[PDB]
Design a protein around this ligand. Structure first.
Ligand SMILES: *[C@H]1O[C@H](CO)[C@@H](O[C@@H]2O[C@H](CO)[C@@H](O[C@@H]3O[C@H](CO)[C@@H](O[C@@H]4O[C@H](CO)[C@@H](O)[C@H](O)[C@@H]4O)[C@H](O)[C@@H]3O)[C@H](O)[C@H]2NC(C)=O)[C@H](O)[C@H]1NC(C)=O
Ligand SMILES: *[C@@H]1O[C@H](CO)[C@@H](O)[C@H](O)[C@H]1NC(C)=O
Ligand SMILES: [Ca+2]
Lengths: 119, 642, 903
């Protein structure tokens, strides 16, 4: 049928260490991926923090630059690796993946995940 | 008789296409139609225009679309609610109706270049002009600049004609002035009571060199928590790298507008590597509310002010998080989304909306009708779960009570709420209904959507139901209307409604069939349903560092910006030193703060159904009418009533 | 110095927008995927920070749309962060922080920070001696360098500091700017609050206005004095009294039923209701669909009345009966108003009138009643027997003057039957004792443009208590005749005498209907209708305020209109002057006058909520260490909460390690584990945190400051308290040994000041002839005098040396005559070094930039650039000890006299 994202609800990871905010799927026959957004949700509105298109990765808030290497070698994986973790990283993160089908049109699945930071 | 129908919006705007659906039920032959719209009393015809021919190769359905022109004599009687007639001529037959008229050309939006300005600086501001379809359009706009006390020190009236509805302006703020919150008010020359604003602080300042961000672990305080409010300071130099410093935090309880300090809370923590933990305990809190009867803090918010200072002494900066809801449950349930009228014997689906204590959505959170364990349903991305129940064929007001059913939270921690729904008053106790159901998913454009058309009635007359006619509401006007067919033996049919940009942010569904029965009584059973859509730009827009992905630039350096957007659009840019926000981060521009207007500015008022068939249509912003006499009642009031 | 970059080869980071990149770019390139791309290339501003970028796009089909923020961060491994405030007051010593950062991941940095010299500021940097320190910033760190200065130049002034690093190539430099402001204090002194109102004692000769200069003789000189003007326009609108509610007139919808006279009885209250409900717009509340069910109930009456239309186009009870003079007109009346409402026939409405004029009139013009009707009670006030000839002439005539709009060239003698019938009224109006004939003929005369003088007086005065037109008896011929009085007052256009007549009828809230309601019902709703059409919408403003200052060239024609949704304006004068404000016709307007300025200070100034004292003294028993003492506390004696003491240290001074730890564990006080573990390498800034500080006592503390970097001069330090809950509520005291009370050496007279931290005069050995002859032909050598010192007025602050010019060797910018005296000032700290004495002669160089005050009273200043030299007296020249100098000094002169610097 169509794709759905295996993203867990709550992920915990330690202070000033790494973690894998998983976001995955299972590729279908023709469904060619064209946009992977990670949207951190600080306020009551969401914002773009990662982006992937025809020209690679593109981080859009400096408070991440160089902490956020999304996982690339595996098909059906868009996990958010994330190093030197801070306290102000506590938030609800989104994973949003866009596919093109053959029939020159498009579809988009997104799921949400809370990042909690332990001590 | 062949019934001739005539649906149009409850309120018709100025300088606006408002469509109007013509139907000739059970009819024979090509039937011409003139359409007419006189002003109200003292009939000068502001739109004779538009005519058509309702052939049998659509089953006698068509429409006509007109613009009410904001004329000179629609600028004569100012401040009382204007009016039009709509003379729907069906050849020899005429079917007119009276419709209310809001002026309301379209929306306006106002970009500041910042949020706070120092005396002697020029405020750069941009006014975007759009008709309620949010398209750009050319008009004339009175633009005021009002001072602290509410007094205007500059006016203008400009034309956005030939400017891509993007009206740039500037205002040199004088070197001497009243400080405080300034305003920029604007209105279309034709809607000077619909005034869009935007504020911006005038204040003396230099800019800081770092920010603070106070935030508790939890977006609320629970009162039986022995730990107390746990809080985290975090402070960072605007240029990315962390701080070593020393921080003064303190708490207090907000209560309406009255704010009470908690002097004994004032702790002085050092800041290591950006972060700095801190706690307002329980006992220290409760002892500062000598009202002393623990519960009394229910609904009273908390607030933290921090004051971080660096170890050099060079700079400091204050920061406060106002509104920590002191609560007995980390959830909150709202039937804002759920209709208030069921269908006896049929189901009644409950769009349960569910929130964390700061009026935001809560995701994957189980809900249950009380009296119904086992049955439960999870809240999806937006904060809506759908419940649904079989009602008994009697006309007894419903009395539903929905709880949160989280494991982890003791029953007294679960939030609950309860409501009352009423029976759709059938036409002369005939027990004939129509029920529209829609599955419960975050709707994106490009996807396609199933609308179940459920028919509940006595079988002696159900064979004479050859179609449900239906209509779509988005942004205040009719988007589309067609026919979803049904042949007998059935009860349910299903409309695969294609969902495009045109529906954002939300859309309603109003549908109805027509039947003659009992003996010679024209019957019209209808239903509605409001659907939320994924709020997003209609088009798209990004800015990125197109110049080789990554690297990290230096004072002076020339880089490059891919701007990626819509062909044949105009983009207007601004850059701002994050500093400015450390001061004021309010009244910036947000797509969603638009869609707020768009869906503050609805004409529709009910999440579905009505008290009867008339209710259905006029709650949902429509004006059904016919040559038989069955019609909605007058819409007196312009605003939705609350 | 060695291995570095010199100051001349360092460019400043200057650009410090708060907002920028304001811009329009159109995505004209062609769509790929349906998604267009423009590559903006862009220069970056020198601000080291993070830039948030926000785009918004506006598209033909795809409406508005807003993008997301996109952060771009601009960074350096090394840089300065110059911490200038917003403003700083003139000739008040201030402190500023210059913060340096070293972010090289594992690299110590030896640095040279320098302030650059600006004559807008007193500061240790002088043009021939830079202000510069050399310090070692550690890795991953910052380091505060203070700079203590004095703002001399009022206005907008500049501050530039720089740094280079050793054994590398890294450099950086900041050039912020801060606001310098008047010594005294901000004041708003009003000069006039006048009311612009032509006519109300603006007078027949329109309002003319003189407005005097401000007070201004306690003004702090060399400061601005803006004279402001505030023109407002104050309106008040409407005298429209409330409409009679809709929920009340429901019974007036009377279905017309019966004969010729029981149809118009029942036609009126439905007909009149429409014409009232059209022009109040009320249909809203009453009901909206209930109109179309009342149109046909007018047309029904109309066509049921078309049957009785007698052969001769007249009107009575039956067709058998003779025609009533009254019912013809009253039909002309009821139809004429309903010309709009439906299709009335042209032959009919201008047919009933042609019957009246040709048959029913006298020579003088009376419209007599040949047929006394059977239902008289309908006719209202006409039921009485007296003056029937007058009031019936007016009733039939009134209808003619409402049916003159349409019918103009059907009935030819209409400019005729109204002319005679008016003179009858106008002549015989003043014999009426009753209100009715005074209130109804008055309306008839009010429609001819003929009611003035004694006729109008009687009209306006027959109204008892200035509102109602009454009579003795049945109280329906008074709610009737008062609404002939309203309709005259609305064709008088007299909105003075109108509002009451209405207000009385809205207290008599008469909702028609019933027996004999007819007229009462008709004219009351035809009058309280016309009121709501014509009555002032918005009371009018059209002020053309003229201002004309002598200062400026041209007038200033401030147009004013209600419709201008501000009705607020301003004019900014720079120079205080006397200026005329004329004003012309209508409305009413505000005219404020204010001047901002500054005045002298009072002697209880501004360390408002913090008294602070600070001292420094030498060592204990046994290089040079001193006792820094801080005794402070807080006004409004309620023990202030938590606070900062911020200590800046003296150029190369350092607190002792031991002393500090005494104070840290001393309770009700705190110093952080960071500032202790810090190096002796750099402890030039230090914050003492405090828990409490009232002014019950003074919280006294002190500690020992080990000097480790020996140098001449040295900068003072500064302690500065504030409570954490306001960096405004603060107080900044200084300290330093030689000068005391930390203050820098400056020389101020009245207003402005001279940066006096430099050479007293050209310094020191051989003093050969060339060596002298040369140095007085440099750039700014404006004068050369041989002087006798004639008096030596020492003082504390500044010295005085009255020198008498014995001869001008080189004159210049100051035409001083020989024998004349000139005063020379010099700082007190130069006294012993100059060491002069009266009766003695000197040699004096000096520049033009050294004078003090305007001609003819030009004081000279001795500084760094003057040459002052002992000149031996005549007889004392012959001495084997003063031999050489005496010969050279009197060789020096001959060169300058005969030749003059041979440039
Ligand atoms: C009454 O007036 C209405 C306006 O309210 C008129 O509406 C007409 O409606 C249709 C459909 O909405 C519109 O477009 C045509 O329909 C085709 C559907 O097969 C469109 O093809 C494709 O649709 C896809 C759906 O997702 C889309 O992805 C794809 O891009 C493409 O659009 C195609 O666009 C057709 O042109 C008509 O244009 C529109 N009329 C007008 C004036 O534009 C309608 O005439 C009246 N209603 C009735 C039924 O009488
Ligand atoms: C008076 O001075 C204050 C500033 O000290 C200023 O804000 C205000 O605008 C002035 N008031 C008048 C009369 O204009
Ligand atoms: Ca939505």
């Amino acid at each position: 049928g169509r794709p759905i994202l295996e993203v867990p609800e709550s992920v915990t990871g330690p202070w000033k260490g790494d973690v894998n905010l998983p976001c995955t799927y299972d590729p279908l026959q023709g469904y060619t991926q064209v946009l992977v957004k990670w949207l951190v949700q600080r306020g009551s509105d969401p914002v773009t923090i990662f982006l992937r298109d025809s020209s690679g990765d593109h981080i859009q808030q400096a408070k991440y630059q160089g902490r956020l290497h999304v996982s690339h070698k595996v098909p059906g994986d868009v996990s958010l690796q994330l190093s030197t973790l801070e306290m102000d990283d506590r938030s609800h993160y989104t994973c949003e993946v866009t596919w093109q089908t053959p029939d020159g049109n498009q579809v988009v699945r997104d799921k949400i995940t809370e990042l909690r930071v332990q001590k | 008789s062949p019934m001739y129908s005539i649906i149009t919006p409850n309120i018709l705007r100025l300088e606006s296409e408002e469509t109007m659906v013509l139907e000739a039920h059970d009819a024979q032959g090509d039937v011409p139609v003139t359409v007419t719209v006189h002003d109200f009393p003292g009939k000068k015809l502001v739109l004779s225009s538009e005519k058509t021919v309702l052939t049998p190769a659509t089953n006698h359905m068509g429409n006509v679309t007109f613009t009410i022109p904001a004329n000179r004599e629609f600028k004569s009687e100012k401040g009382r609610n204007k009016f039009v007639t709509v003379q729907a001529t069906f050849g020899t037959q005429v079917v007119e109706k009276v419709v209310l008229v809001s002026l309301q050309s379209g929306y306006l939006f106002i970009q500041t270049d910042k949020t706070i300005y120092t005396p002697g600086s020029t405020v750069l501001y941009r006014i975007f002009t759009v008709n309620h379809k949010l398209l750009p359009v050319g008009r004339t706009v009175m633009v005021n600049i009002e001072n602290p006390e509410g007094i205007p020190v500059k006016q203008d009236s400009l034309s956005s004609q030939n400017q891509l509805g993007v009206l740039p302006l500037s205002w040199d703020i004088p070197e001497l002035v009243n400080m405080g919150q300034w305003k920029i008010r604007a209105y279309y020359e034709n809607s000077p009571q619909q005034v869009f604003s935007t504020e911006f602080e005038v204040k003396e300042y230099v800019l800081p060199s770092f920010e603070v961000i106070v935030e508790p672990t939890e977006k609320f305080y629970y009162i039986y928590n022995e730990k107390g409010l746990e809080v985290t300071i975090t402070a960072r130099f605007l240029y990315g790298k962390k701080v070593e410093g020393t921080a003064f935090v303190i708490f207090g309880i907000q209560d309406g507008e009255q704010r009470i300090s908690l002097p004994e809370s004032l702790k002085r923590i050092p800041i290591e590597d950006g972060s700095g933990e801190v706690v307002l305990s329980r006992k220290v809190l409760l002892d500062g509310v000598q009202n002393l009867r623990a519960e009394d803090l229910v609904g009273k918010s908390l607030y933290v002010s921090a004051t971080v200072i660096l170890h050099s002494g060079s700079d400091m900066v204050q920061a406060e998080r106002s509104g920590i809801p002191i609560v007995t449950s980390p959830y909150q349930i709202h039937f804002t989304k759920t209709p208030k009228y069921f269908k006896p014997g049929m189901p009644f689906d409950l769009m349960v909306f569910v929130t964390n204590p700061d009026g935001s959505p809560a995701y994957r959170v189980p809900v249950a009708v009380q009296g119904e364990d086992t049955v439960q349903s999870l809240t999806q991305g937006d904060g809506v779960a759908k419940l649904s129940i079989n009602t008994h064929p009697s006309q007894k007001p419903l009395s539903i009570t929905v709880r949160t059913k989280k494991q982890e939270l003791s029953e007294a921690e679960q939030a609950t709420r309860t409501m009352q729904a009423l029976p759709y008053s059938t036409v002369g106790n005939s027990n004939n209904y129509l029920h529209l159901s829609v599955l419960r998913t975050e709707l994106r454009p490009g996807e396609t959507l199933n609308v179940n058309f459920l028919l509940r009635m006595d079988r002696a007359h159900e064979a004479k139901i050859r179609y449900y006619t239906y209509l779509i509401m988005n942004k205040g006007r009719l988007l589309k209307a067609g026919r979803q067919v049904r042949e007998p033996g059935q009860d349910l049919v299903v409309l695969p409604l294609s969902i495009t940009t045109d529906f954002i942010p939300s859309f309603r569904l109003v549908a109805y069939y027509t039947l003659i029965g009992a003996s010679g009584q024209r019957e019209v059973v209808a239903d509605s349903v409001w659907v939320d859509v994924k709020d997003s730009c209609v088009g798209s827009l990004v800015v990125k560092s197109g110049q080789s992905e990554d690297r990290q630039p230096v004072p002076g350096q020339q880089m490059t910006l891919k701007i990626e957007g819509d062909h044949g659009a105009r983009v207007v840019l601004v850059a701002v030193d994050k500093g400015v926000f450390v001061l004021n981060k309010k009244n910036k521009l947000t797509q969603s703060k638009i869609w707020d207007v768009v869906e503050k500015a609805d004409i529709g008022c009910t999440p579905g159904s009505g008290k009867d068939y008339a209710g259905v249509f006029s709650d949902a912003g429509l004006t059904f009418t016919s040559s038989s006499g069955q019609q909605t009642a007058q819409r007196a009031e312009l605003q939705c009533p609350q | 110095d060695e291995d570095i970059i010199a100051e001349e080869n360092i460019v400043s980071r200057s650009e410090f927008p708060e907002s920028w990149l304001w811009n329009v770019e159109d995505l004209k390139e062609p769509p790929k995927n349906g998604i267009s791309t423009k590559l903006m290339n862009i220069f970056l501003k020198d601000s080291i920070t993070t830039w948030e970028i926000l785009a918004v796009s506006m598209s033909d089909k795809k409406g508005i749309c807003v993008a997301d923020p996109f952060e771009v961060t601009v960074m350096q491994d090394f840089f300065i962060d110059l911490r200038l405030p917003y403003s700083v007051v003139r000739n008040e010593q201030v402190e500023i922080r210059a913060v340096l950062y070293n972010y090289r991941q594992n690299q110590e940095l030896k640095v040279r920070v320098e302030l650059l010299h600006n004559p807008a500021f007193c500061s240790l940097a002088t043009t021939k001696r830079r202000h510069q320190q050399t310090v070692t910033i550690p890795p991953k760190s910052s380091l505060s360098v203070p700079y203590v200065i004095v703002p001399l130049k009022t206005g907008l002034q500049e501050v530039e500091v720089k740094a280079a690093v050793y054994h590398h190539f890294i450099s950086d430099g900041v050039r912020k700017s801060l606001k310098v402001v008047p010594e005294g204090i901000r004041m708003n002194k009003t000069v006039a609050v006048r009311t612009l109102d032509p006519e109300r004692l603006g007078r027949e000769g329109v309002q003319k206005e003189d407005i005097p200069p401000a007070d201004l003789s306690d003004q702090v000189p060399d400061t601005e004095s803006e004279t402001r003007i505030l023109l407002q326009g104050t309106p008040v609108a409407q005298m429209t009294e409330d409409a009679v509610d809709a929920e009340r007139l429901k019974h007036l919808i009377v279905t017309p039923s019966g004969c010729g006279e029981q149809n118009m009885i029942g036609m009126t209250p439905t007909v009149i209701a429409v014409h009232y409900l059209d022009e109040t717009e009320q249909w809203e509340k009453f009901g909206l669909e209930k109109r179309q069910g009342a149109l046909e109930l007018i047309k029904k009456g109309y066509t049921q009345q078309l049957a009785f239309r007698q052969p001769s186009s007249a009107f009575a009870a039956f067709v058998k009966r003779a025609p009533s003079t009254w019912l013809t007109a009253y039909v002309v009346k009821v139809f004429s108003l309903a010309v709009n409402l439906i299709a009335i026939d042209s032959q009919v409405l201008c047919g009933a009138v042609k019957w009246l004029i040709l048959e029913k009139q006298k020579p003088d013009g009376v419209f007599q009643e040949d047929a006394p009707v059977i239902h008289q009670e309908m006719i209202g006030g006409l039921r009485n027997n007296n003056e029937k000839d007058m009031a019936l002439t007016a009733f039939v005539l009134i209808s003619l003057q409402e049916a003159k709009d349409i019918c103009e060239e059907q009935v030819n003698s209409l400019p005729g039957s109204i002319t005679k019938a008016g003179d009858f009224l106008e002549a015989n109006y003043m014999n009426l004792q009753r209100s009715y004939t005074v209130a109804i003929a008055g309306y008839a005369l009010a429609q001819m443009g003929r009611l003035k003088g004694p006729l109008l007086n009687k009209f306006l005065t027959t109204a008892k208590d200035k509102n109602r037109w009454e009579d003795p008896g049945k109280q329906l011929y008074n709610v009737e005749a008062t609404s002939y009085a309203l309709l005259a007052l609305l064709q008088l256009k007299d909105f003075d005498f109108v509002p009451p007549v209405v207000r009385w009828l809205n207290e008599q809230r008469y909702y028609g209907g019933g027996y004999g309601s007819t007229q009462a019902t008709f004219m009351v709703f035809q009058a309280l209708a016309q009121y709501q059409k014509d009555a002032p919408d918005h009371q009018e403003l059209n002020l053309d305020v003229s201002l004309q200052l002598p200062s400026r060239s041209s007038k200033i024609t401030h147009r004013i209109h209600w419709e201008s949704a501000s009705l607020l304006r301003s004019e900014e004068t720079k120079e205080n002057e006397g200026f005329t404000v004329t004003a012309e016709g209508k409305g009413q307007g505000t005219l404020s006058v204010v001047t901002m300025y500054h005045a002298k200070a009072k002697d209880q100034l501004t360390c408002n909520k913090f008294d602070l004292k600070v001292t420094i003294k030498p060592a204990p028993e046994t290089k040079n260490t001193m006792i820094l003492e801080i005794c402070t506390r807080y006004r409004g004696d309620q023990d202030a909460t938590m606070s900062i003491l911020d200590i800046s240290m003296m150029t190369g001074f350092a607190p002792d390690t031991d002393d500090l730890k005494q104070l840290a564990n001393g309770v009700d006080r705190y110093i952080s584990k960071y500032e202790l573990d810090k190096a002796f390498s750099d402890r030039n800034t230090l914050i003492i945190y405090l828990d409490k500080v009232s002014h019950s006592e003074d919280d006294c503390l002190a500690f020992k400051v080990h000097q480790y970097f020996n140098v001449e001069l040295i900068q003072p330090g500064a302690v500065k308290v504030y409570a954490y809950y306001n960096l405004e509520e603060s107080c900044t005291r200084f300290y330093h040994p030689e000068k005391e009370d930390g203050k820098l050496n400056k020389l101020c007279r009245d207003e402005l000041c001279r940066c006096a931290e430099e050479n007293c005069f050209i310094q020191k050995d051989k003093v050969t002839l060339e060596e002298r002859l040369d140095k007085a032909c440099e750039p700014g050598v404006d004068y050369v005098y041989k002087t006798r010192l004639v008096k030596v007025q020492l003082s504390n602050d500044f010295d005085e040396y009255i020198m008498a010019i014995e001869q001008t060797i080189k004159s210049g910018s100051d035409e001083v005559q020989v024998g004349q005296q000139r005063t020379f000032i010099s700082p007190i700290k130069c006294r012993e070094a100059l060491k002069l004495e009266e009766k003695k002669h000197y040699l004096m160089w000096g520049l033009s930039s050294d004078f003090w005050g305007e001609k003819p009273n030009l004081s000279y200043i001795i500084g760094k650039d003057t040459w002052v030299e002992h000149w031996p007296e005549e007889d004392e020249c012959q001495d084997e000890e003063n031999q050489k100098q005496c010969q050279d000094l009197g060789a020096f002169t001959e060169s300058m006299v005969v030749f003059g610097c041979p440039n």
